[PDB]
Design a protein around this nucleic acid. Structure first.
Ligand SMILES: [Mg+2]
Ligand SMILES: [Mg+2]
Ligand SMILES: [Mg+2]
Ligand SMILES: [Mg+2]
Ligand SMILES: [Mg+2]
Ligand SMILES: [Mg+2]
Ligand SMILES: [Mg+2]
Ligand SMILES: [Mg+2]
Ligand SMILES: [Mg+2]
Ligand SMILES: [Mg+2]
Lengths: 111, 126, 178, 144, 241
RNA sequence: GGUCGGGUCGAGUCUGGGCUCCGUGAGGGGGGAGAAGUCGUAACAAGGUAGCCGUAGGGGAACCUACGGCUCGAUCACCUCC
RNA sequence: GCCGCUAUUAUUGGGCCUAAAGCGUCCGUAGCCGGGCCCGUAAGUCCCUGGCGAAAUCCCACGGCUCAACCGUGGGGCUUGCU
RNA sequence: GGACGGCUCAGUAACACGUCGGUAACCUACCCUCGGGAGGGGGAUAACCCCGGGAAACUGGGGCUAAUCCCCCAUAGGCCUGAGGUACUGGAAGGUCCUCAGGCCGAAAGGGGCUCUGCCCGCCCGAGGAUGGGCCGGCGGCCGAUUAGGUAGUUGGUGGGGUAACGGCCCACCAAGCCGAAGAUCGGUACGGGCCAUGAGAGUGGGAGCCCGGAGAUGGACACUGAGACACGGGUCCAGGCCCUAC
């Protein structure tokens, strides 16, 4: 089983589209982060949200900034709304999708 | 369709106003409709970015068909079952995912005859 | 959005303060200055020294130690401070010390000119050498090592001891505060 | 109470309120909406050229008693009539009709009127390409 | 806009040239060639500015076309030719050889050397293709290419160094990238620094590997493996600074 | 290369429907200064009907009346807190 | 005309009984602020280190045009930073 | 070779710019290195000569000739597909390489010069590099709510076509997504930055001149050639204006 460049557990089942990194021919390159899923409606398409804090030099304070990313979701990793997914950058898959989910830590409960 | 640049709409739905005119390098070309010909296989040659070369097939005859590493030139008869479009089976147009009735039977295409100028196909076991 | 060469003198915040006016009038007569511009130029020199010294008091090492050393050795070289000096002494310095390091003033001293105004004319008409070099800028700040090499030019009538004005100037051999 | 948002993670709302009340600042508003540029007949300029239409006189406010001389002037860049004050003593006599005249601001506090002249915002500076100060002090006679 | 760049403004020039950026408007735009723009300087600047054998480019071009300057044993007549790190610039008429190496400030300098070392050029291997004929093409940091065979393909690895006899191009003295290997840095913050390798870290994805290096005075500093150039097994053996 | 067509990117040209923008401009509105003027005397002292808010109606005009409120109300007579 | 003056836009650092200014009063969504102890994580935060953030411009010293301005050598900083 | 340089800042609130990264999703003439090759034929036409036409701009016919001009053939090579081997690099192989199949496309100037039997400058192919770009992404930087819902190829998917290349870029068929009160959409203003001015600083303001990037060449639209242009000193049309004319 292949060993895509960032050490994390692969899925259990091995049947997917060619747009899966592990079982297909899709490649990943560049940056990777963990994020929270906020939509899982589209077929093989989720929305992942980050939450970083931005410093304001003048007011000497911080503000939150949310950023969505629009990743690809292979059926082997059917991440749902709530799950802390790991996402990585790849080629364009669509107009908005240039990222792919690779791994999950599930979340049945949230706050 | 000519221009293959960016779309004039943001995912939000908003409008884009092109800040620049359209460049020669972000255009396209009229598509090949690789149909079945009676004979005299027809092709044209495209000069492309870099002075590179594409072979665009317009009328195919032969369709090199493959089974398990063995090939043969087997005289296309017609087109069946194009998932890309039903008008294509009507017009008898070949594409990459198409199915073709041939000598030696049915074969699923694997090539892009608008790009490589050849029809390569794979025997379906039945 | 480019460089735009800026003045190297600062003008006062108010133009008509009686205190500043009196003080500057006295300095300008004592040192024979054409311009408040010239005076303010030397004041600004001093101010920049002082600001550097301030920053380096309120600074930390490996750099701002280099610049401490550089400031002190520059001022030593100019003759404003002794070699055993400190930033405290920088802050003690004065525009009068700067003006005393002008060439016009050192030539009024070194018994070469008899008057700061005549010193100015000697410099400008080309009768003063500093280390063999003719200088015509009376605002030139002399280095403490170049000070002892100041002399009339070789191509100067004043270098002929028979010259009348040379004879007068040496009739009054004087120096000290200038 | 202690002012609005002072929290470490409140910079957004803080920035917002400062903007909201900058709009109560009238200088900022004029600068940012460009109201002067919209209502200025000089079209954002320090000077302007105009044709003298007529010569008039204006009464000083209340306590002062005098007839300040002036001219109604048609500006060329827009065709607009403004009134301009002619400093000096015989300036209105040195000036004639259909004459080209240069139009400065009169000074005055908010780019506005000055002194006992209630409603005049502009000065005459040149008359047929000659300074009115020199015309008044005698030198540099007028071309036309 | 419509195509490529044929010019270079002397302010927009590389930071590693010793160029006098405000004296004129233009600089020599280097040709494509052995090295990169970040690790090169043109031969005109070497002939005119560094060595001072010409005050003028016409004189320099006359020299270069006469053929008095070699670069790795080969005559180079183009004034835009790139001369790069660890390159040997020879003038036989004067009996001089220089190694183009970087400074600690990060700029390129000429270190004087003699004939023996001047017939040597160390080459970081930097890649390894399999080419037709089932042969191995080593793709070296001077943009050079050397063909070897599937017998010593394993003696040849990517970050290794090869000493090369340059007017003939015969490999001598492969120097491997290992612990204890003497190394010379070429770019970065720790530029003209040298020592023995201590450690290598890998960093999963496309993040470059990093090497920890020990200098002569016992200090211990890191840089990139790609910027770590091997010059020896235990001693630099190429007379660096 | 023409001449017929059949497809395409296609500016433009006619037009009808909307939507604003600009240059003007009758005729009504109020606003701001000023000039002395005209009618009165609303307000400030209990300003000669205490004043003001809200709503409503009325009136040459300031204004008046009603219902509810306020003291940013004066005076003298009570009890109380001081 | 811009900055300053102007703590007349106020994070530093302004005010809201009578001077401009507390919603008529309450309830509550987002947001912001949040009691005490223990354990963990180590996201912010801090330290150290690698790679980048062009040159010019800015500061400093030293040198060359008479000094200077200007130019060069070198040190530092700058780029909101990102990694 | 003319696609650089040079000019300007209309447009543009955008991956345009800055910065970090990516391209295993791409092109690259000139240049470098390596490895190889240059075989066999053929043809035309300027210049020139005869005659001109036209107001000009421009342009015709016939004759003659060459080439590092053009064409052909084969050999190399290139591209596609299928099968399997696992030698290479990489963080990771739809990549490279090896063997085999079926096909399509398909080079070259052994030219010129010298001190000529050797040297110099050169032609073609392949592998890489370099140079210069294309495209993607994260972060980052105005105003307005007297602009609150917007979007209909619009968001995604399956299959394709097209492109140098990924991509709703386009198409056919499936679904109902996407953005938004942390302010979408719309409107307004504006080339972006490095920088500059000011000020004790915090900050406020500007972003013509130098560099970097971008865009544009009367407005609008479209193409040819070339490695590269949809081309400021090249082409075509419309609109608008002007000039010469034998109209
Ligand atoms: Mg009353
Ligand atoms: Mg009354
Ligand atoms: Mg009353
Ligand atoms: Mg009544
Ligand atoms: Mg105010
Ligand atoms: Mg206040
Ligand atoms: Mg810099
Ligand atoms: Mg052929
Ligand atoms: Mg504009
Ligand atoms: Mg023009």
């Amino acid at each position: 089983m292949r060993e895509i460049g960032l050490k994390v557990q692969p899925p259990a089942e091995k049947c997917d589209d060619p747009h899966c990194p592990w079982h297909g021919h899709l490649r990943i390159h560049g940056r990777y982060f963990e994020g929270i899923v906020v939509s899982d409606k589209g077929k093989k398409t989720v929305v992942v949200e980050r939450r970083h804090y931005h410093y304001l030099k003048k007011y000497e304070r911080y503000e939150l900034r949310r950023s969505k990313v629009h990743a690809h979701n292979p059926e082997c990793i059917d991440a749902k709304v709530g799950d802390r997914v790991l996402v990585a950058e790849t080629r364009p898959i669509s107009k908005t999708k240039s990222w792919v989910v690779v791994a999950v830590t599930k979340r049945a409960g949230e706050r | 369709a000519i221009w293959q640049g960016r779309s004039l709409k943001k995912p939000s739905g908003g409008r884009i106003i092109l800040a620049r005119k359209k460049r020669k390098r972000e255009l396209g070309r009229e598509p090949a409709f690789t149909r079945v010909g009676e004979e005299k296989e027809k092709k044209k040659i495209i000069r492309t970015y870099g002075g590179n070369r594409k072979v665009r097939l317009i009328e195919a005859i032969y369709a090199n068909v493959f089974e398990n590493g063995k090939g043969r030139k087997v005289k296309v008869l017609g087109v069946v079952e194009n998932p890309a479009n039903r008008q294509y089976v009507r017009r008898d147009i070949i594409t990459k995912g198409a199915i073709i009735e041939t000598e030696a039977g049915r074969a699923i295409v694997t090539s892009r005859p608008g790009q490589d100028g050849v029809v390569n196909a794979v025997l379906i076991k039945e | 959005d480019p460089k735009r060469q800026r003045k190297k003198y600062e003008t006062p915040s108010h133009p008509w303060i009686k205190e500043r006016l009196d003080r500057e009038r006295v300095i300008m007569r004592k040192y024979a200055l054409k311009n408040k511009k010239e005076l303010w130029r030397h004041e600004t020199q001093l101010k920049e020294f002082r600001r550097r010294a301030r920053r380096l008091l309120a600074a930390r090492g490996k750099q701002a130690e280099v610049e401490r050393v550089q400031l002190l050795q520059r001022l030593n070289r100019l003759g404003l401070l002794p070699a055993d000096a400190v930033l405290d002494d920088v802050l003690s310095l004065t525009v009068e010390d700067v003006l005393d390091r002008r060439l016009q003033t050192i030539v009024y001293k070194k018994g070469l000119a008899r008057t700061p105004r005549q010193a100015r004319q000697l410099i400008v008409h080309g009768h003063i050498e500093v280390n063999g070099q003719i200088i015509r800028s009376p605002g030139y700040l002399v280095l403490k090592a170049e000070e002892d090499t100041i002399t009339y030019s070789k191509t100067s009538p004043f270098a002929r001891e028979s010259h009348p004005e040379r004879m007068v100037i040496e009739q009054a051999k004087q120096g000290g505060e200038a | 109470g202690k002012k609005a948002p002072y929290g470490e993670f409140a910079g957004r709302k803080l920035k917002l309120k400062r903007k909201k009340f900058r709009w109560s600042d009238i200088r900022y508003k004029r600068r940012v909406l460009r109201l002067k540029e919209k209502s200025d007949p000089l079209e954002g300029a320090p000077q302007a050229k105009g044709i003298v239409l007529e010569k008039i006189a204006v009464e000083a406010k209340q306590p002062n008693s005098a007839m300040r001389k002036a001219v109604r002037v048609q500006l060329i860049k827009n065709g607009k009539v403004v009134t301009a004050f002619t400093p000096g003593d015989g300036a209105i006599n040195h000036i004639d009709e259909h004459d080209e005249v240069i139009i400065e601001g009169i000074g005055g506090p908010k780019g506005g009127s000055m002194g006992d002249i209630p409603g005049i915002r502009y000065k005459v500076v040149k008359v047929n390409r000659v300074s009115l100060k020199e015309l008044v002090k005698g030198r540099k006679e007028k071309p036309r | 806009r419509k195509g490529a760049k044929r010019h270079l403004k002397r302010l927009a020039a590389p930071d590693q040239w010793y160029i006098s950026r405000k004296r004129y408007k233009w600089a020599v735009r280097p040709r494509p060639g052995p090295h990169s723009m970040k690790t090169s300087i043109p031969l005109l600047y070497i002939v005119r500015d560094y060595l001072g054998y010409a005050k003028t480019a016409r004189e320099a071009r006359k020299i270069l076309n006469e053929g008095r300057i070699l670069v790795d044993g080969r005559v180079r007549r183009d004034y835009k030719f790139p001369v790069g790190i660890m390159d040997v610039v020879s003038i036989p008429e004067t009996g001089e050889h220089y190694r183009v190496l970087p400074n600690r400030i990060g700029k390129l300098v000429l270190h004087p050397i003699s004939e023996k070392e001047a017939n040597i050029k160390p080459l970081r291997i930097s890649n390894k293709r399999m080419v037709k004929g089932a042969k191995v093409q080593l793709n070296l940091h001077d943009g050079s290419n050397h063909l070897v065979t599937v017998d010593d393909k394993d003696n040849y690895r990517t970050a290794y160094t090869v000493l090369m006899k340059v007017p003939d191009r015969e490999v001598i003295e492969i120097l491997p990238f290992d612990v204890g290997a003497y190394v010379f840095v070429t770019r970065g913050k720790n530029v003209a620094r040298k020592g023995k390798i201590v450690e290598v870290r890998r960093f999963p994805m496309g993040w470059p590997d990093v090497v920890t290096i020990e200098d002569e005075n016992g200090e211990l500093f890191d840089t990139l493996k790609e910027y770590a150039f091997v010059v020896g097994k235990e001693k630099p053996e190429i007379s660096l600074p």
